[PDB]
Each structure stands twice: as C-alpha cells, then as structure tokens.
C-alpha cells in the first residue's frame, strides 16, 4: 500500500552526466557512446544571451574551446556540431557506462524523472509531468541547464527532456534530446510566457483510482454520468476533455476496483462542484493530475 510520487532509479543516467565548460559558462552534458549532448547556450556569454545568433557564435568556436570533464577525467573534444538547440560534441572516448537508450519526445500529460545536476554532478531526482502548456514544474537553480529527464523500460533509458531555462512564473522549459523545444519557447533571455494551462483530466481519474485501491473511498457515489455531460462540466473548470481513448486506458484500473470509468467521472464532477469539504485524498487537499494511468498501475497492487 501507499502512493508516492516516485522517480525511476537514476544510476543509469548518473553514469552519463558530465560537465561542459566554454569560457566562463558551465553546464551539464549527457555522454552517450562518443558524443556529449548539451544545450547550445554553453557558447553564450552573459551579454550574448539577450539576442544570441547561435550560428555566428558557433562558427567562431573550435573544439579546444569546449572543456568536458567526466569526474576526474577530461575528455578531448574532436568534433562539434549544432542540432537545433543542442550541441553534439564528439569526444575521443566512448562512455563505457552508456546504457541502452532511445531519444523519445513526450506528450503533454506524460510524466518522467528529472536528474537535477550541477557542474556535471547529480544532486537530486524527482518526477515531473509535461503540462498541457509544455512547461514543467521543476526545481532548478543556476547551473542546472543540461540536466535531463527520462523514463526507464526494461533497462532501456528513454531520454525525453533536456533542461534549458526558467520562465518568469517560475516554471521550466526545455527541449527533447534532438534539441527541439517543448512549446513556444526559445533559448534566449527575453520576456516569454507560457499559454494558459489546464488540468490533466485522465490523470486525475487515475489518481482517484489509486486512492480507491489505497482505501480512500469517501468521494464515491452511487451516481453516474455520460461522457458528454462530464465534459460539459470539465470545460467549466478548465479540465482537458476526456476522450474515449482515455476511458479505454483507464479500463484496467476500472476492472481492478469495480468502479466504472463514467462512475468515477460522476465522483470527479461532484468534487469539482463541491470541493473536498475539509477531507483529503491520498494525503492531498487538491485534485492531483501528475500521475498517469501507467504510474498508478506501476505502483499499485494488481
């Protein structure tokens, strides 16, 4: 029993983290085989950052301008190239700790584990969801740029996020490992704001099933609703529409608990319209939307 925000074990990724220094700018890189991937922001100085022309900045660099340190071992850079908002630094040594890996791009509503790092050294691990507005609510300080997000499946690490920046609201933005930003953001120190965000309805329902599996049942009712009538309510509360595919994905949790998906929707409708009236669900006084159906199944009894 129990339900916690749980990250994947980080060791496979820890063995891949390095420090990249260009001039006085330092950040983290990801060393897989004979390539180190890092944010192209490493080539900017403080003043370059308002309006950097990265192609210009890069053509003025050579391999020797990049110092890559893996623990107490300096790696010699023997080539460099830019791919979108990441740099690929070819090094003379293949990382002996490279795990099986993929570069995947995730969807809004999906979760992943973040290994926060500073100076190439891992400092903490936590779970994040990609919000509907393509930001993440992380915990990152200066020096964290280049920290990565990932999921693990059967010892294959699927890297999905590289951290770049913090927006004025305190949320975070970054790229996939091909260097393409999630969302309408750019790697420069300008006023940028995310679109209005929405609540991930299917994940709230998944977490309500986790709660039932864990013995929290007070929010259940003998009522039901239609999908159409539910979405009419969800729209008023700034929840994403719930699709038939979402209903299907919740099938296994519905089967395990005996609570039809549309019945749980009726419970959520009542929670939205009434609030919690002083009670908690799985230790929270708010409706939690950062657990996917997979996260619930992975963690909850069968």
């Amino acid at each position: 029993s129990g339900f916690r925000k749980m990250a994947f074990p980080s060791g496979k990724v820890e063995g891949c983290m390095v420090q990249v220094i260009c001039g006085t700018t330092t950040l983290n890189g990801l060393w897989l085989d004979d390539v180190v991937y890092c944010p192209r922001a490493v080539i900017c100085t403080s003043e370059d950052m308002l309006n950097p022309n990265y192609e210009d900045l890069l053509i003025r660099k050579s391999n020797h301008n990049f110092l890559v340190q893996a623990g107490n071992v300096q790696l010699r850079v023997i080539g460099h190239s830019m791919q979108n908002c990441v740099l690929k630094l070819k090094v003379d040594t293949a990382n002996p700790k490279t795990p099986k890996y993929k570069f995947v791009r995730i969807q809004p509503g999906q979760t992943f584990s973040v290994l926060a790092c500073y100076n190439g050294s891992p400092s903490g691990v936590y779970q994040c969801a990609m919000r509907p507005n393509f930001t993440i609510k992380g915990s990152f300080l200066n020096g964290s740029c280049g920290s990565v997000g990932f999921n693990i499946d059967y010892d294959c690490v699927s890297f999905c996020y590289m951290h770049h920046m913090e927006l004025p609201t305190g949320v975070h933005a970054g790229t996939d490992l091909e260097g393409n930003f999630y969302g309408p953001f750019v790697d420069r120190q300008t006023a940028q704001a995310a679109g209005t965000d929405t609540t991930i309805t299917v994940n709230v329902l998944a977490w309500l099933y986790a709660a039932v599996i864990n013995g929290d049942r007070w929010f259940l009712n003998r009522f039901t609703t239609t999908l159409n009538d539910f979405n009419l309510v969800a729209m008023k509360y700034n929840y994403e529409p719930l699709t038939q595919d979402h209903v299907d994905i919740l099938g296994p949790l519905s089967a395990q608990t005996g609570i039809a998906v549309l019945d749980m929707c009726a419970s959520l409708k009542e929670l939205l319209q009434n609030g919690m009236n002083g009670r908690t669900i799985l230790g929270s006084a708010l409706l939690e939307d950062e657990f996917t159906p997979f996260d619930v199944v992975r963690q909850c009894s069968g």
Binding site: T25, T26, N142, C145, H164, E166, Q189, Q192
Partner: peptide
C-alpha cells in the same frame, strides 16, 4: 521579467 538560461558561471 525575462526568461533565464540556467547555466552556471565559473
């Protein structure tokens, strides 16, 4: 306020 590229200084 502007976005911040969260690199470090050294």
């Amino acid at each position: 306020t502007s976005a911040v590229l969260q690199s470090g200084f050294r």
